[PDB]
Design a protein around this ligand. Structure first.
Ligand SMILES: [Cl-]
Ligand code: NA
Ligand code: NA
Length: 438
């Protein structure tokens, strides 16, 4: 009598890999498709016909099972409501490269990102097509964590090939909130290699092999602990943890290989609040609890059962998980039958013991607005940083890169119209208007 149940929410996805919201109040859910798409699902349950992001041309997907290449992850800037910034990680065309790129939603349309605004941050080289990782997330510190798998690169493979990474197998951590204009991302002071020119400054921890989706506790009440990141891993199946006030390798699981996990922070289940949930491909879930007393970890199983329309099974295999803005969680699934007809699916987890909309859970949809920041309206000739800093293209300047540069200057009422281009009035001639007619 303690089971949870599963509700189908949408079908007809193409090989979904996960889903998340954008923290802008709009209760939109962004569904990632592996071939390279992000679709929008409204709180009313419509899927928009135009992708929010369509980069299937840049991304090298993959056909075989086990071929982990495609769109990997998506993270929205913590202040996206204002700056319209998002970060994606995909694999593109030494087998391939794993980019991590910043994009900016379009200025004219809240529901489509401006493909022109790409702004690459990392490019990690890859020899194989497994153990990639790619999970992006923002901690409450405001920094950008990137969990990378070892790419199954050996120490052999690393010493006899220059142009590898030192990044693979690691949790990197960046400060995207830079005012600098010459390097894409700053580096946190707290980093365990700030300025150190031996081990790479981005790295914040390492030794991950084949991580799944990693649970992320943001400790809203817990004032002592800042962020905990808990990862399933194979190579057989084990956990790895990270707490912030360099990672520890236990094994609380006693069965097969997990897809990943999540920390439930929703409102609809009371019983489940704060729990760490992990699941496998076939939908056997478990919870993890730390003993306050001994700090040891225990798996309790968590079961599914039918309760009305809300079933105790779902079809296909789990590929990923999803969390909406209200904190409710989803399963993304597909099969070999499912994937051939684009019938991947989004299911919601429900606590049948509680109402679907308890008084405490109501919330008012705040419809996504056109980008409004100062930097967005004015910075034409360059690019904005997340902080509002306009970073001029080459040959421009001024606060918002509005005024053009000419070395040398324009003369006889000339006018520096675009970089090294003078408008001469009628009658002076030349590159800089320096010669007079006749
Ligand atoms: Cl907490
Ligand atoms: Na949203
Ligand atoms: Na805190």
């Amino acid at each position: 009598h303690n089971c949870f149940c599963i509700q189908e929410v949408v079908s007809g996805l193409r090989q979904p890999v996960g889903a998340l919201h954008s923290g802008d109040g709009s209760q939109r859910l962004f569904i990632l498709e592996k071939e390279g798409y992000v679709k929008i699902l409204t709180p009313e349950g419509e899927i928009f016909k135009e992708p929010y992001l369509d980069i299937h041309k840049l991304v090298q997907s993959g056909i075989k099972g086990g071929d982990e290449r495609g769109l990997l992850s998506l993270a929205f800037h913590p202040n996206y409501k204002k700056n319209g910034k998002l970060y994606v990680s995909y694999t593109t065309n030494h087998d391939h490269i794993l980019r991590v790129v910043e994009y900016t939603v379009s200025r004219k349309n809240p529901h489509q990102v401006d493909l022109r605004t790409a702004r690459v941050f990392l490019e990690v080289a890859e020899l194989h097509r497994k153990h990639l990782g790619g999970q992006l997330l923002f901690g409450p510190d405001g920094f950008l964590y990137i969990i990378l798998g070892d790419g199954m690169i050996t120490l052999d493979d690393m010493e006899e090939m220059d142009g590898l990474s030192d990044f693979t197998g690691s949790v990197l951590r960046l400060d995207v909130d830079t005012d600098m204009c010459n390097v894409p991302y700053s580096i946190p002071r707290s980093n365990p290699h700030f300025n150190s020119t031996n081990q790479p400054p981005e790295v914040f921890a390492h030794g991950l092999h084949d991580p799944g989706r990693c649970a992320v506790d943001r400790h809203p009440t817990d004032i002592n602990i800042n962020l905990t990141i808990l990862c399933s891993d194979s190579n057989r199946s084990s956990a790895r943890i990270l707490q912030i006030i360099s990672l520890l390798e236990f094994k609380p699981f006693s069965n097969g290989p997990l897809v990943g996990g999540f920390v439930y922070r929703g409102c609809q289940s009371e019983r489940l609040y704060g729990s760490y949930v992990f699941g496998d491909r076939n939908g056997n879930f478990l919870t993890l609890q730390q003993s306050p007393v001994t700090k040891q970890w225990q798996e309790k199983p968590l079961c599914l059962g039918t309760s009305g329309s809300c079933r105790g099974y779902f079809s296909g295999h789990i590929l990923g998980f999803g969390e909406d803005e209200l904190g409710e969680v989803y399963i993304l699934s597909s099969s070999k039958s499912m994937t051939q007809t684009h019938n991947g699916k989004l299911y919601k987890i429900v606590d049948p013991k509680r109402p679907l909309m308890p008084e405490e859970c109501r919330a008012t949809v705040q419809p996504a607005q056109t980008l409004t920041s100062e930097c967005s309206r004015l910075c034409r000739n360059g690019y904005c940083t997340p902080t509002g800093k306009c970073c001029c293209s080459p040959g421009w300047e001024g606060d918002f890169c509005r005024t053009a540069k000419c070395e040398p200057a324009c003369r006889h009422g000339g006018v520096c119209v675009r970089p090294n281009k003078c408008l001469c009035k009628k009658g002076y001639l030349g590159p800089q208007c320096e010669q007079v007619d006749r």
